[PDB]
Structure 1
Amino acid sequence: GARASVLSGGELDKWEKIRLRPGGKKQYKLKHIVWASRELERFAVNPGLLETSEGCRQILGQLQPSLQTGSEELRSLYNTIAVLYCVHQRIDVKDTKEALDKIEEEQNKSKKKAQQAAADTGNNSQVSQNY
């Protein structure tokens, strides 16, 4: 498309502003987007639907667990998706780690919100012992 479907020209220019490594000299680009797209399509995921911050977040959440024991490439893909999502939400980034920490922080906060929320309006209990 004129300005792709995932990210527009400008969005792509910025998307290609994130570094792959903190001590490295790599950055995102249409190449990475194509790679991710290839993996997405190969994973049975729609690329266009990956344009929405929701779809990006969904994928990230889909690999979230796959990360537990995912591959190096799979992990890198997840990070890339996270960055994409950040751009979708209009989040500034510098490195893949930064974006990862950004999403990691947000997510963590989210989980908490869920906890504090439940607690606030809920309850829980437990027990365990043996002599």
Structure 2
Amino acid sequence: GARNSVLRGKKADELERIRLRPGGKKKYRLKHIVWAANKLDRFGLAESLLESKEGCQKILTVLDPMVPTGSENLKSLFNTVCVIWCIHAEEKVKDTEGAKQIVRRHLVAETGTAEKMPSTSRPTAPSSEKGGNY
């Protein structure tokens, strides 16, 4: 909504350094961010989440299940969001592939603590239903 450029000086040096492929010559650019942001808008998510670790994490969780229920046009985004989050979590990568791994490992670790199911999520609110319509 404000300013013209979002990428920083040092941060950019890392993004522009990352290559779209492991052995290719193409690197990440604003072009890829746009196509990604536009998707979040139509999909139903926010765009400001692309500039926040906590935000990008909320997006990956949505595109996660979209993999087994989407096509290349979808996988591309998922592989793009995994790169943005890293930049926010202070993770140095080399190629889209390497970045995808760093993220995956971080997810499997969080989805591997269901051997107890502790009291984390608050219970249903105390709804007192008495009577009917007026």
Please classify the TM superposition score into its range, dividing by the shorter chain length.
Answer: 0.7 to 0.9
Distance in 1 of aligned mates of 2:48 and 2:63? 18
Question: What is the CA RMSD across the aligned residues, in angstroms?
Answer: 2.0
TM-superposed CA distance for 1:39, in Å, is 1.7
In the alignment of these two chains, the number of paired residues is 117
1:87 correspondence with 2:87: yes
CA contact (8 A) 1:12 1:29 kept: no
Greater helix proportion: 1
* Structure 1 stretches lacking a partner, 5+ long: 123-131
TM-score by length of 1: 0.78
Distance in 1 of aligned mates of 2:25 and 2:73? 18
Q: 1:63 matched to which residue of 2?
A: 63
TM-superposed CA distance for 1:54, in Å, is 1.2
1:17 correspondence with 2:17: yes
Distance in 2 of aligned mates of 1:64 and 1:15? 22
The higher radius of gyration belongs to 2
Q: 1:37 matched to which residue of 2?
A: 37
Distance in 1 of aligned mates of 2:76 and 2:44? 18
3-state SS of paired residue (1:65):
coil
Distance in 1 of aligned mates of 2:53 and 2:35? 19
Q: 2:123 matched to which residue of 1?
A: none
1:74 correspondence with 2:88: no
Distance in 2 of aligned mates of 1:42 and 1:8? 26
Letter in 1 for 2:93: V
Distance in 1 of aligned mates of 2:4 and 2:13? 14
* Structure 2 stretches lacking a partner, 5+ long: 120-134
TM-superposed CA distance for 1:24, in Å, is 2.0
Segment drifting more, 50-59 vs 38-47: 38-47
Alpha-carbon displacement from aligned partner over 1:80-130 (angstroms, at most 9, x marks no partner):
111000001110111111111111111112212x235x27x69xxxxxxxx
Letter in 2 for 1:11: K
Report 1 or 2 for greater relative contact order, CA contacts < 8 Å, sequence distance ≥ 6. 1
TM-superposed CA distance for 1:27, in Å, is 1.4
3-state SS of paired residue (1:57):
helix
User: Runs of at least 4 residues of structure 1 off by over 3 A?
Assistant: none
TM-superposed CA distance for 1:2, in Å, is 5.1
TM-score by length of 2: 0.76
